[PDB]
Amino acid sequence: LNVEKINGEWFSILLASDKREKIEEHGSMRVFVEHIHVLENSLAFKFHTVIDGECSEIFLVADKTEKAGEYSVMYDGFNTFTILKTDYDNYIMFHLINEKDGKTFQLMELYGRKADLNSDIKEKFVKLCEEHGIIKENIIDLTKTNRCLKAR
Ligand SMILES: CCCCCC(C)=O
Ligand SMILES: [Cl-]
Ligand SMILES: [Cl-]
121 CA distance to ligand 2 centroid (A)? Predict the structure, then answer.
């Protein structure tokens, strides 16, 4: 992966977890990406999220860890993530593990360079989720949600 090539603007399209509450409407992980800035040994993210019906911003910096390809960031506990698949100019898929109180759950995210992606790419993401034990019912199509696009 040439991580520089993931720099720039992105939109959150599909959001999936094995702990569904975390990505439901008031969940901590129901966040909508606006950009990823690639720095020397980190990735700087800007998100939106909805809190009590109002759009709000979250900025996070993830550091490279000792494992190649892996990044870590503190947000509602301790997260580690990797990039699973990308073509840089259309889609990117992330896999994240959150730890809190010694318990874990997975998040998978499909982002697009535009506000939607075609059915083929979405279906591929769905099968990758399932490969990770994230069942179809636990994958949310954020294009049918408030993604705070107007705050962008
Ligand atoms: C929301 C905490 C993790 C942020 C970075 C990713 C991969 O979404
Ligand atoms: Cl939550
Ligand atoms: Cl929206």
Answer: 28
Check pocket membership of 73 for ligand 1, CB cut-off 6 A.
Answer: yes
Structural resolution in Å: 1.4
Rounded to a whole number, what is the largest CA-CA distance in the chain? Answer: 39
In contact, 17 and 29? CB cutoff 8 Å: yes
Cβ neighbours of 101 (radius 10 Å): 6
Structure determination technique employed: X-ray
Measured from the Cα of 43, ligand 1's closest atom is 5
> Does residue 13 contact residue 117 with C-beta atoms inside 8 Å?
yes
DSSP state of 145: S
User: Whose C-alpha lies nearest to ligand 1, atom 2?
Assistant: 75
Say if ligand 1 is within 6 A of residue 79 CB: yes
User: Where do the domains of the chain lie, and which CATH numbers do they carry?
Assistant: 1-152 (2.40.128.20)
CA dihedral 27, 29, 75, 117 (to 10 degrees): -160
Q: From the centroid of its chain, how far is CA 75?
A: 13
